[PDB]
Write a protein that binds this ligand. Structure first.
Ligand code: CL
Length: 169
């Protein structure tokens, strides 16, 4: 409904989450392809994705930087990106800029928050469990495709060393 109340709710739920390690399942309407992996998140900006043998890879995301390690070809790739949406998972909501908070739907002991990125015009739906506060889903929608991510076997506020979000030759 009202935008600033939605901002309050989102920042509360995200403050609750200081980090998480979970398994993820990702799919898209573009195809019938499914993807599985692990995801690590440490709130001061650090995100990491381990994609499983069908597409074996390790991605580390922080702000504008993607670090991609292909484990098959054992190849590294450091690239500058924007991706304001996914990295929102690892974000202090107080600091986040260039975002519109559209809606907040509550139903079935489950909380959904809708936002849009001003630049990319990409929509994001964030799905939390009310009790305990956990991020269980994230969908990203555009006029052409929609992507679904579902997290399971979640571990909120668990210890993860900053050395985890790092690999090198
Ligand atoms: Cl409702």
């Amino acid at each position: 409904g009202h935008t600033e109340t939605i901002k309050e709710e989102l920042l509360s739920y995200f403050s609750a989450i200081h980090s998480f390690k979970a398994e993820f399942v990702q799919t898209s309407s573009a195809n019938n392809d499914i993807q599985h992996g692990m995801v690590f998140m440490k709130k001061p900006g650090l995100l990491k994705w381990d994609y499983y043998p069908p597409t074996p890879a390790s991605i580390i995301m922080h702000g504008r930087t993607i670090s991609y390690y292909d484990k098959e070809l054992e190849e590294y790739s450091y690239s500058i990106i924007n991706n304001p949406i996914i990295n929102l998972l690892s974000s202090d909501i107080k600091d986040i800029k260039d975002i519109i908070f559209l809606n907040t739907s509550t139903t079935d002991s489950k909380k959904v928050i809708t936002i849009q990125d001003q630049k990319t015009a990409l929509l994001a739906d964030i799905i939390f469990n009310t009790n305990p506060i956990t991020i269980v889903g994230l969908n990203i929608a555009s006029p052409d495709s929609i992507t679904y991510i579902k997290f399971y076997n979640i571990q909120n506020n668990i210890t993860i060393k900053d050395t985890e979000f790092k690999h090198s030759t």
